[PDB]
Design a protein around this ligand. Structure first.
Ligand SMILES: *[C@@H]1O[C@H](CO)[C@@H](O[C@@H]2O[C@H](CO)[C@@H](O)[C@H](O)[C@H]2NC(C)=O)[C@H](O)[C@H]1NC(C)=O
Ligand SMILES: *[C@@H]1O[C@H](CO)[C@@H](O[C@@H]2O[C@H](CO)[C@@H](O)[C@H](O)[C@H]2NC(C)=O)[C@H](O)[C@H]1NC(C)=O
Ligand SMILES: *[C@@H]1O[C@H](CO)[C@@H](O[C@@H]2O[C@H](CO)[C@@H](O)[C@H](O)[C@H]2NC(C)=O)[C@H](O)[C@H]1NC(C)=O
Ligand SMILES: *[C@@H]1O[C@H](CO)[C@@H](O[C@@H]2O[C@H](CO)[C@@H](O)[C@H](O)[C@H]2NC(C)=O)[C@H](O)[C@H]1NC(C)=O
Ligand SMILES: *[C@@H]1O[C@H](CO)[C@@H](O[C@@H]2O[C@H](CO)[C@@H](O)[C@H](O)[C@H]2NC(C)=O)[C@H](O)[C@H]1NC(C)=O
Ligand SMILES: *[C@@H]1O[C@H](CO)[C@@H](O[C@@H]2O[C@H](CO)[C@@H](O)[C@H](O)[C@H]2NC(C)=O)[C@H](O)[C@H]1NC(C)=O
Ligand SMILES: *[C@@H]1O[C@H](CO)[C@@H](O[C@@H]2O[C@H](CO)[C@@H](O)[C@H](O)[C@H]2NC(C)=O)[C@H](O)[C@H]1NC(C)=O
Ligand SMILES: *[C@@H]1O[C@H](CO)[C@@H](O)[C@H](O)[C@H]1NC(C)=O
Ligand SMILES: *[C@@H]1O[C@H](CO)[C@@H](O)[C@H](O)[C@H]1NC(C)=O
Ligand SMILES: *[C@@H]1O[C@H](CO)[C@@H](O)[C@H](O)[C@H]1NC(C)=O
Ligand SMILES: *[C@@H]1O[C@H](CO)[C@@H](O)[C@H](O)[C@H]1NC(C)=O
Ligand SMILES: *[C@@H]1O[C@H](CO)[C@@H](O)[C@H](O)[C@H]1NC(C)=O
Ligand SMILES: *[C@@H]1O[C@H](CO)[C@@H](O)[C@H](O)[C@H]1NC(C)=O
Ligand SMILES: *[C@@H]1O[C@H](CO)[C@@H](O)[C@H](O)[C@H]1NC(C)=O
Ligand SMILES: *[C@@H]1O[C@H](CO)[C@@H](O)[C@H](O)[C@H]1NC(C)=O
Ligand SMILES: *[C@@H]1O[C@H](CO)[C@@H](O)[C@H](O)[C@H]1NC(C)=O
Ligand SMILES: *[C@@H]1O[C@H](CO)[C@@H](O)[C@H](O)[C@H]1NC(C)=O
Ligand SMILES: *[C@@H]1O[C@H](CO)[C@@H](O)[C@H](O)[C@H]1NC(C)=O
Ligand SMILES: *[C@@H]1O[C@H](CO)[C@@H](O)[C@H](O)[C@H]1NC(C)=O
Ligand SMILES: *[C@@H]1O[C@H](CO)[C@@H](O)[C@H](O)[C@H]1NC(C)=O
Lengths: 384, 420, 211, 198, 49
């Protein structure tokens, strides 16, 4: 409370200190139980690559890929990635991966990026302007030079099967005029059924307990629970109005797990003024006392205040008709607030009360009329 | 079509014609005022950053933006309790009505508490409560006064009003019989109090029937409580707008903060997360700013409702159209979701007759003027009458005063003035 | 010949479950109450344009409709997508085909894939080199023509073909009727019910009330 | 605790200025909160990117301050319009408006100045020593129903009097302090007592 | 000058719209205040910033 208010003295009141949150008990990993190592040898180490006018697309599916086996290699002259960072690819997984395998002149690598233009990027290898994945390229003069004019050139992912047919004289004596191999890995990173995944080992599932979790690369934290949500066979995730994930099909056992966030609420701190006492009570706003003397108010679980069956004027307002005060040997008490003393007006159809005497009250009303006339030179405030 | 402003009416004016109402109707009119709005606390760190520590460290670069948003929403929230306290806690003691309802034929049973209800609301408060209708750091805080405590305050305000008149506002509640309180309410509109006692059963039946029309209106007409449902709908629309803005990219690769943190390594992720922090902080500043402006409107309505409680319920108001249309007699508060309903009881004059009138009367060369009321003729005889109800009295030195003589007054008439 | 499409030809726009929500989406849908061409499965399978994409459907009791052809020139001067589907098995190819003189089943080959009483509904589209298919089946009370009411098409298949398409055609069989509508870029508002089924929709460009 | 409305207006404006000053310590994602660090460490092409983060955040900080001062000034103006109305109705007048100028029936108010505000010392009559009486709406005399011109008919048990409503002062019931209207039979709870003719 | 309260309301709303229109001439750090200059000079990925 002192740190929240940035003060060493604190007045009588209720102060919303930091939000209470139940912490994750365990970290769960749920991935498809698919055993094949992916055929990346057939991608990177095929004897001859296709020509860039007619580039070859390999679908990778139903397998595990350790992307470190690629990215740690000294063999690659570039490994530029878009929408993903190459260090993260083992922690994350995909519906499919497509490897576009082809050869170019070493000068041309600049054209192979989203939004580029020129005699490859506007002609025969247009990437999407929002491409997600990696362009991997290396010098192949030792493999693909002979020259080797067979490396012919001529919307996103179009194949280009007077006419624009052109060639390079790839000879071993050529450095930018040498052949380079390119593999573009395009990742089908949809919230749909995963089949190409990193080497991450799956844990057992955990339910009805707050856990950190990873489903097919979707990180989160919550209470996993069984649910009535009838996912259609093509659906793998469900969403809230915020687009946060609200349910998942477990990728190994096809049951639908509803996700609830781990329990949270403001820690209101109830204090008499520090001038009178350092004794304090705590309200966990909207929390149930089973989730945290102890007293369940409708405002939340209240702890360190004694519930009292009397009623008094409201000192410190808790909510839902409950207030707290410091009272007797002194202690914090919590009570239902008294609205005022009950009074039967002595009504009958023929009784009147007439006041036989009066008092001149003088009562003080205090009204704000003005406030300090500030002026800010915004150029001297902003730019000094 | 071109809109009609109302039916056209030539008032039948002349230098000597007056219309005096020979009968009245007790109108009960319903005024509905917002008094509070849903108390929201947003944990700006959980809204913006969703319990990511990586995002939470970037949100520290922005300084006290997050704490001053919570401070503004806490001021709004504490003000909703204050607004509610200022309207309903105007009664210092919880007054209760007697076991015998000997109110001179007036029937408050539909506006007084019913002990069969789970919260002890009246019949009309139960209609009002039927007719008017979380996970991303957004939370709703309960009001300090529960709806059962609001109903004990409207019960005490109403039981004070019925058993004691205005007197429970000015000091201790003084009992007075309800027909005698209503006879004071008649003097407070310039209607002579014999008009109540002579028409007491009629006035009680017109009140009881007018309360019956309130029940029929509220039972039939779902759109009746539109001001309170509009406040509920604006609070819901503002929170749904704030939640749906979490799905916005603001130019980031995804609106899902866990996609950014699972796909990207730290130096790339921080650039994308700062676009989400920027847009979510701007989204939350927009919400808190429009809630501060909306809270100022609810506070203006709660200050108005607190003033109607004091002047209409705890008093009788001379202020034209403040406590409903017609001459104000009395008002009864009823609780409603986020608001108050005043059942403003007003005297409306109802059955005019035309008459000839004079400003003054000549007798023995003296000009006589009415002490209270107006001089009127039925065509052959002259009477003095109170302004707001036709009761012809013989013109007499006791209901008139002399000043000067017949020469001065434009439109004086010659008639005898009786001497008792 | 022609008919009114009514509220037909809507599909689940993405593979995410949603429920008790009205969700806005912009995609290549069949416009509501569109004017869709009609054909008979006996004595009617010319080459049509594909435009941005196609809704195709058939009122049936006899399984006479058994596939489709797509591409540009359709004459072995190009790769051309072939889809054969007999409602128990499927064969798909993009190879440089020449098709037979009369496309019915008598009862550089770079990509391949393998797997009245009734109405079958389908949707076909090509985006960023990916060719996409959706479908639905229903019983029908109207014997004569394409029926009123709403029920959405689930996705089936998505093919990384990287090929241009501007024409299409259909395959029959010999020992029913069929419809063609064109998809257009439309905003729709979709009603997902409590069981996460799309049960109703609004075509936002149909009329001012829909907007 | 009495002055809390004025002291809170002082405190809110001090808290708002301290928040605005403390926001100069914020980086907003720049390499430093200090504009002279950026200009002494970075050359203009690099510096202008960092300075634009400070300009963006300080301008947003100052927009937030001015917006909340516009909303707070509208609240002070509502309070000043109320104080200007209390001045007119209760210092320059006597107000019939119930609880507008203190609890009790308003007699008069005195203004006193205070820091950023006004204080009204609302003088009010509060009635203080109730006594119970039997009461009647009207009184029968010669078959005539009499009603009080001002005040109420009350009884001490044996005798009937008329008094003003807000202070017990038993006056004998006469044709001067009462008016007739019609016969007895119409009035619910009329009582029989002599009305004296002066 | 008698109708100063009504003319002040007219002037404030005119000043607010003129301020809103004049703010279209601001760069906010873009290469031009004019959106057609950006779109005629720059290609997609360079223009979008
Ligand atoms: C006051 O008015 C209510 C109706 O507004 C009367 O209540 C009804 O009373 C009869 C018996 O006399 C019951 O059969 C009805 O069911 C009651 N209706 C409701 C809605 O409760 C009430 O009797 C009146 N009170 C007096 C003293 O006349
Ligand atoms: C004054 O107006 C009231 C209506 O507001 C009249 O009372 C009604 O009289 C009719 C017969 O003419 C009855 O059928 C109704 O039941 C009465 N209504 C009520 C509420 O009692 C009344 O008669 C009028 N009096 C005069 C003298 O004009
Ligand atoms: C105007 O009012 C007077 C008094 O009410 C009326 O005069 C009385 O009329 C009745 C018959 O209607 C007679 O029995 C009374 O003897 C009359 N009294 C007096 C003192 O003359 C008069 O009729 C009314 N005139 C009009 C035009 O309505
Ligand atoms: C009201 O009565 C007075 C007399 O009481 C009328 O005044 C007289 O009018 C006649 C004719 O003009 C004169 O001969 C008298 O000398 C007047 N006497 C006085 C004292 O002025 C007066 O005209 C009457 N008014 C009306 C409107 O009839
Ligand atoms: C897809 O195929 C169509 C032909 O069916 C191509 O359209 C022609 O393009 C040329 C320019 O290259 C135009 O001069 C013709 O007028 C177009 N003909 C028609 C019938 O539209 C189209 O360019 C091809 N697109 C791609 C991406 O390959
Ligand atoms: C009610 O008030 C009357 C008048 O003030 C009281 O009558 C007087 O009582 C005293 C004795 O207490 C006698 O000396 C007087 O002669 C009485 N005056 C008259 C005019 O009768 C009466 O006693 C009071 N009654 C009660 C119950 O308080
Ligand atoms: C008020 O006084 C009158 C008489 O002045 C009482 O009226 C008499 O009441 C009795 C009993 O009901 C009848 O036998 C007489 O015929 C009535 N006389 C008259 C002239 O009406 C009346 O009862 C008294 N009221 C009260 C409340 O005591
Ligand atoms: C995955 O595990 C389930 C049982 O948990 C088993 O039925 C299934 O055949 C396994 N799949 C593979 C690809 O081994
Ligand atoms: C490709 O071959 C080289 C040796 O020529 C080997 O070091 C590398 O690991 C291979 N990569 C893959 C993905 O098979
Ligand atoms: C502060 O403490 C003193 C005793 O040290 C006590 O007399 C006084 O009442 C306290 N005031 C408040 C507001 O706590
Ligand atoms: C609190 O939680 C328990 C389950 O742990 C439940 O039985 C009880 O009803 C809850 N009470 C409230 C007021 O939420
Ligand atoms: C409050 O009173 C009830 C009986 O009315 C009793 O059972 C309960 O133990 C009391 N609780 C406390 C905290 O004193
Ligand atoms: C009053 O007199 C005028 C004479 O023109 C007439 O139009 C009007 O209807 C009359 N009103 C009543 C209530 O008699
Ligand atoms: C009242 O007006 C009429 C004309 O409308 C006129 O004849 C008469 O003299 C006027 N009387 C007075 C006293 O002005
Ligand atoms: C459909 O369009 C054609 C022209 O393209 C027209 O002849 C036909 O009448 C239209 N059908 C309907 C039902 O509007
Ligand atoms: C569908 O075609 C396959 C061969 O392509 C065949 O085995 C199967 O029996 C056919 N189904 C029907 C319903 O004829
Ligand atoms: C495949 O392409 C070659 C030219 O690269 C062409 O000669 C051949 O005819 C094509 N294949 C078919 C089946 O037409
Ligand atoms: C959802 O499905 C159940 C049966 O599984 C059914 O009872 C319920 O009515 C359905 N709800 C809707 C809105 O279709
Ligand atoms: C008035 O009479 C009632 C009779 O029950 C009594 O309770 C009440 O205390 C009396 N009030 C005064 C002010 O004497
Ligand atoms: C009051 O009630 C009594 C019976 O308790 C009755 O005699 C009397 O007439 C009533 N008086 C009034 C003013 O209602």
């Amino acid at each position: 409370t002192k740190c929240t208010l940035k003060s060493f003295t604190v007045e009588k009141g209720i102060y919303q200190t930091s939000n209470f949150r139940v912490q994750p008990t365990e970290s769960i990993v749920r991935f498809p139980n698919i055993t094949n190592l992916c055929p990346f040898g057939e991608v990177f180490n095929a004897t001859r690559f296709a020509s860039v006018y007619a580039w070859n697309r390999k679908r990778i599916s139903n397998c595990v890929a350790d992307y470190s086996v690629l990215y740690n290699s000294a063999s690659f002259s570039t490994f530029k990635c878009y929408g993903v960072s190459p260090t993260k690819l083992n922690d994350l997984c995909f519906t499919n991966v497509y490897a576009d395998s082809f050869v170019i002149r070493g000068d041309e690598v600049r054209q192979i990026a989203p939004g580029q233009t020129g005699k490859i990027a506007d002609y025969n290898y247009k990437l999407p302007d929002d491409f997600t994945g990696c362009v991997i390229a290396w010098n192949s003069n030792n493999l693909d030079s002979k020259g080797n004019y067979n490396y012919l050139y001529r919307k996103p992912f179009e194949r280009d099967i007077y006419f624009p047919l052109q060639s390079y004289g790839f000879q071993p004596t050529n450095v930018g005029y040498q052949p380079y191999r390119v593999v573009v890995l395009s990742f089908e990173l949809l919230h749909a059924p995963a089949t190409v995944c990193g080497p991450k080992k799956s844990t057992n599932l955990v339910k009805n307990k707050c856990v950190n979790f990873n489903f097919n690369g979707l990180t989160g934290t919550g209470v996993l629970t069984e649910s009535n949500k009838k996912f259609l066979p093509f659906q793998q995730f469900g969403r809230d109005i915020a687009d946060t994930t609200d349910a998942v099909r477990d990728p190994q056992t096809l049951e639908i797990l509803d996700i609830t966030p781990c329990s949270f609420g403001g820690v209101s701190v109830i204090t008499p003024g520090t001038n009178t006492s350092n004794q304090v009570a705590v309200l966990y706003q909207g929390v149930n006392c089973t989730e945290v003397n102890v007293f369940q108010t409708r405002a939340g679980c209240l702890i360190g205040a004694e519930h009292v069956n009397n009623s008094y004027e409201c000192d410190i307002p808790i909510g839902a008709g409950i207030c707290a005060s410091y009272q007797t040997s002194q202690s914090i008490i919590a009570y239902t607030m008294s609205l005022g003393a009950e009074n039967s007006v002595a009504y009958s159809n023929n009784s009147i009360a007439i006041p036989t005497n009066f008092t001149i009250s003088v009562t003080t009303e205090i009204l704000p009329v003005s406030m300090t006339k500030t002026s800010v030179d915004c150029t001297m405030y902003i730019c000094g | 079509y071109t809109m009609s402003l109302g039916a056209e009416n030539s008032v039948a004016y002349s230098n000597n014609s007056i219309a005096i109402p020979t009968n009245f109707t007790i109108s009960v009119t319903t005024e509905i005022l917002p008094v509070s709005m849903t108390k929201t606390s947003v944990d700006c760190t959980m809204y913006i950053c969703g319990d990511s520590t990586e995002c939470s460290n970037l949100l520290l670069q922005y300084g006290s933006f997050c704490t001053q948003l919570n401070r503004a929403l806490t001021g709004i929230a504490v003000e909703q309790d204050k607004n509610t306290q200022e309207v309903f806690a105007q009664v210092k003691q919880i007054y209760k009505t007697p076991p015998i309802k000997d109110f001179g034929g007036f029937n408050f049973s539909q506006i007084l508490p019913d002990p069969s209800k789970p919260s002890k609301r009246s019949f009309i408060e139960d209609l009002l409560f039927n007719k008017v209708t979380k996970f991303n750091g957004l939370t709703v805080l309960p009001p300090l006064l529960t709806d059962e405590m609001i109903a004990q305050y409207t019960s005490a305000l109403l039981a004070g009003t019925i058993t004691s008149g205005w007197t429970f506002g000015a000091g201790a509640a003084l009992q007075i019989p309800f027909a005698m309180q209503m006879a004071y309410r008649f003097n407070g509109i310039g209607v002579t109090q014999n008009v109540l006692y002579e028409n007491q059963k009629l006035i009680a039946n017109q009140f009881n029937s007018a309360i019956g029309k309130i029940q029929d209106s509220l039972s039939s007409t779902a759109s009746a409580l539109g001001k309170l449902q509009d406040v509920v709908n604006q609070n819901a629309q503002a929170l749904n707008t704030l939640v749906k803005q979490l799905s916005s990219n603001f130019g980031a690769i995804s609106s899902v903060l866990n996609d950014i943190l699972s796909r990207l390594d730290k130096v790339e992720a921080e650039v994308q997360i700062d676009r989400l922090i920027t847009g979510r902080l701007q989204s939350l500043q927009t919400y808190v700013t429009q809630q501060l402006i909306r809270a100022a409107e609810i506070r203006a309505s709660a200050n108005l409702a607190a003033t109607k409680m004091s002047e209409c319920v705890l008093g009788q108001s001379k202020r034209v159209d403040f406590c409903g249309k017609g001459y104000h007699l009395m008002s009864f508060p009823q609780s409603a979701p986020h608001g108050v309903v005043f059942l403003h009881v007003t005297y409306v004059p109802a059955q005019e007759k035309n008459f000839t009138t004079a400003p003054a009367i000549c007798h023995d060369g003296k000009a006589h003027f009415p002490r209270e009321g107006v001089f009127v003729s039925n065509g052959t005889h002259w009477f003095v009458t109170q302004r707001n109800f036709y009761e012809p009295q013989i013109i007499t030195t006791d209901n008139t005063f002399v000043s000067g003589n017949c020469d001065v007054v434009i439109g004086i008439v010659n008639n005898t003035v009786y001497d008792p | 010949a022609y008919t009114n499409s009514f509220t037909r030809g809507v599909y689940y726009p993405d593979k995410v479950f949603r429920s008790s929500v009205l969700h806005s989406t912009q995609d290549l849908f069949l416009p509501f109450f569109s004017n869709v061409t009609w054909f008979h499965a006996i004595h009617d399978n010319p080459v049509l344009p594909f435009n941005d994409g196609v809704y195709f459907a058939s009122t049936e009791k006899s399984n006479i409709i058994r596939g489709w052809i797509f591409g540009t020139t359709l004459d072995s001067k190009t790769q051309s997508l072939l889809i054969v589907n007999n409602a128990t098995n499927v064969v798909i190819k993009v190879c440089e085909f020449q098709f037979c003189n009369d496309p019915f089943l008598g009862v550089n080959c770079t990509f391949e894939y393998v797997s009245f009483k009734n109405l079958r509904e389908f949707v076909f589209k090509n985006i960023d080199g990916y060719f996409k298919i959706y479908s639905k089946h229903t019983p029908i009370n109207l014997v004569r023509d394409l029926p009123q009411g709403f029920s959405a098409l689930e996705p089936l298949v998505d093919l990384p073909i990287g090929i241009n398409i501007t024409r299409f055609q259909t395959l029959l069989a010999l020992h029913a009727a069929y419809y063609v509508g064109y998809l257009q870029p439309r905003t729709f508002l979709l009603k997902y019910n409590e069981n996460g089924t799309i049960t109703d929709a609004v075509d936002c460009a149909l009329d001012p009330l829909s907007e």
